[PDB]
């Protein structure tokens, strides 16, 4: 569930690029950032654990940033191309590749 961090238009639709506070409906706990790293073993830990607590802090708020559809399309194209090239690499490693497969590559 989402909680506004500012005045809203009579509970209208959630605006784009708007700060929100996340809460767990089943537990009724609000999200919170903890400094306990998840990769303390690493020389320079970069992963910080998150936890949900019953108390709510106005400071702990996660903003939702919209991503353009073009970026998602490019990412999907990149993933699909990587998969197809991996398949072509496997075929070449096997030693035989069909002419149609070569043209597709």
């Amino acid at each position: 569930e989402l909680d506004p961090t500012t005045l809203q238009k009579t509970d209208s639709f959630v605006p784009r690029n708007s700060y929100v506070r996340l809460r767990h409906l089943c537990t009724n706990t609000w999200i919170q950032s903890t400094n306990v790293p998840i990769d303390i073993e690493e020389e320079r830990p970069i992963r910080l654990m998150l936890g949900t607590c019953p108390t709510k802090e106005d400071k702990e708020a996660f903003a939702i940033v919209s991503v353009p559809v073009s970026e998602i399309r490019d990412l999907d194209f990149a993933n699909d191309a990587s998969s197809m090239l991996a398949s072509a690499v496997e075929k070449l490693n096997e030693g035989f590749i069909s002419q149609n497969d070569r043209r597709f590559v």
């Binding site: 961090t5 500012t6 700060y19 106005d58 400071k59």
Partner: protein
């Protein structure tokens, strides 16, 4: 010296945003530029009162 800037104490609030009641803020003197502070020093004459 009475002039004071109200500034966001929370990263969520940004300059130019409307101040909302119940929000923690920072009061910065315009000329001095050093924010107000509730120090721990206690006045001798008054008991339990700390200087600002």
């Amino acid at each position: 010296g009475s002039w004071l800037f109200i500034q966001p104490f929370w990263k969520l609030r940004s300059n130019g945003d409307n101040v909302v009641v119940g929000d923690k803020v920072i009061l910065n003197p315009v000329n001095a530029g050093q924010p107000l502070h509730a120090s721990n020093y206690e006045l001798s004459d008054n008991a339990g009162c700390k200087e600002v």
